[PDB]
Design a binder for this molecule. Structure first.
Ligand SMILES: CNCc1cnn(-c2ccccc2)c1
Ligand SMILES: [Cl-]
Ligand SMILES: [Cl-]
Length: 163
């Protein structure tokens, strides 16, 4: 565990993270995909051996000794708002189980289902609150990675508001 477990946010490529493991915003078939998933495939391609896993689950594959936690959020194009919300919450609970099992002191995590799986909706608050619900009982330092300048400010505000 971290001595004073924290949340932080950085605006940069999660493939350049400074944490002990990474969460991939994976597809269920273990395909290279787009966005975060394509960057993770380019940096840790060995971690896509038998990485396929259902929606709402996380599966860890080692790249050398570096753990890649493949977390499959729902594609809100295909799910109802209600069912998608349940699967998005479930994916983050499985990430917390993996982070705990691995014994890491830090984890790099993207906001699941906020990009090409968002169904064209802004899901920053929905995805972030499911992240907190899952990770708050863990003692790893959590570093959230984003792309958008306005998202960085909104994530930073949500973190600071609970300190
Ligand atoms: C990196 N993608 C996250 C993101 C940024 N912006 N939005 C967004 C904003 C308004 C309406 C729909 C979607 C999602
Ligand atoms: Cl970058
Ligand atoms: Cl996404």
């Amino acid at each position: 565990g971290a001595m004073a477990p924290s949340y932080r946010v950085k605006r940069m490529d999660i493939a350049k993270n400074d944490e002990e493991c990474v969460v991939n915003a994976a597809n269920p078939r273990g395909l290279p995909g787009d966005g975060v998933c394509k960057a993770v495939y380019k940096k840790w391609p060995e971690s896509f051996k038998n990485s396929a896993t259902p929606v709402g689950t996380a599966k860890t594959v080692m790249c050398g000794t570096y753990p890649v936690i493949h977390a499959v959020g729902p594609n809100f194009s295909n799910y109802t708002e209600s069912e998608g919300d349940r699967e998005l919450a479930a994916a983050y609970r499985e990430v917390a189980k993996e982070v705990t099992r691995l014994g890491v002191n830090s984890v790099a995590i993207p906001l699941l289902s906020t990009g090409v799986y968002s169904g064209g909706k802004d899901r920053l608050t929905q995805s972030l609150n499911h992240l907190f619900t899952a990770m708050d009982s863990t003692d790893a330092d959590v570093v959230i990675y984003c792309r958008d300048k306005e998202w960085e400010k909104k994530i930073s505000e949500a973190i600071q508001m609970r300190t």
